[PDB]
Amino acid sequence: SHITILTLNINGLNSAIKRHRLASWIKSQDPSVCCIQETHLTCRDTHRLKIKGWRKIYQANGKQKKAGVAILVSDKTDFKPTKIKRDKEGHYIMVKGSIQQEELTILNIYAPNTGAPRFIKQVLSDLQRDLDSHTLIMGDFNTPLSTLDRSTRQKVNKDTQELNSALHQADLIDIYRTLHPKSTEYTFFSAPHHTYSKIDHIVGSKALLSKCKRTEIITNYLSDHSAIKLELRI
Numbered sequence: 001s002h003i004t005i006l007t008l009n010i011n012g013l014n015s016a017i018k019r020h021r022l023a024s025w026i027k028s029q030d031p032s033v034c035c036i037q038e039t040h041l042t043c044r045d046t047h048r049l050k051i052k053g054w055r056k057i058y059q060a061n062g063k064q065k066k067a068g069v070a071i072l073v074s075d076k077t078d079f080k081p082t083k084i085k086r087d088k089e090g091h092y093i094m095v096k097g098s099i100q101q102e103e104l105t106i107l108n109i110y111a112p113n114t115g116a117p118r119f120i121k122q123v124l125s126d127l128q129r130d131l132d133s134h135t136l137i138m139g140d141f142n143t144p145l146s147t148l149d150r151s152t153r154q155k156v157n158k159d160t161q162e163l164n165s166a167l168h169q170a171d172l173i174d175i176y177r178t179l180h181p182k183s184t185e186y187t188f189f190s191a192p193h194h195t196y197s198k199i200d201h202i203v204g205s206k207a208l209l210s211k212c213k214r215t216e217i218i219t220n221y222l223s224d225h226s227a228i229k230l231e232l233r234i
């Protein structure tokens with residue numbers, strides 16, 4: 001009745017060397033479900049991503065070696081998919097399914113560097129029909145959601161404020177920030193002027209809060225992004 005969901009922008013998987021490296025890290029972390037961003041695999045190279053122990057994999061890829069997302073499910077986890085929706089451009093993938101008769105919807109997103117919060121709000125609208133009370137939206141938003149997400153505590157811009165409102169209209173909350181309202185933890189440590197920011201996020205339905213046992217930010221040597229882990233009581 002416990003599953004862990006892990007998100008990491010992996011910064012490219014095209015080379016077999018990097019794929020082998022990612023696989024070892026996953027084996028260690030032993031997540032039930034893993035959301036990866038920036039695989040950079042074109043839609044004709046998706047078959048390249050194989051990780052022993054995580055046979056169920058769902059990918060979304062554009063026509064070029066940029067963006068690219070994947071959701072990997074552990075062989076030990078009974079996830080039964082019912083709907084998969086893939087971005088033509090490789091910036092998100094949504095998987096709906098059930099674990100032990102419990103519905104879960106996972107939207108893995110990689111937002112672009114330019115116009116990130118507007119882009120996420122658009123995807124929310126495009127998929128408004130697919131969001132529900134058991135929805136997790138995780139990945140590299142390429143934007144803070146509040147001042148505490150930046151070591152500078154710079155006010156978030158109007159667009160971000162709009163994204164935050166669209167999220168609340170759908171009864172979606174920043175799950176990390178809700179469990180850790182005062183924390184100053186970061187996932188990207190090369191922000192502009194020697195600054196740090198939390199641009200990776202785990203957002204989710206308010207009704208999932210009762211199931212959230214723990215979150216953990218996992219700094220690593222694989223990527224220029226730290227991973228985020230969520231422990232969920234199914």
Ligand SMILES: NC[C@H]1CC[C@H](C(=O)O)CC1
Nearest residue numbers: 142143144150191197199
């Ligand atoms: N690499 C882009 C990333 C830099 C931090 C920035 C911020 O803190 O607003 C937004 C996203």
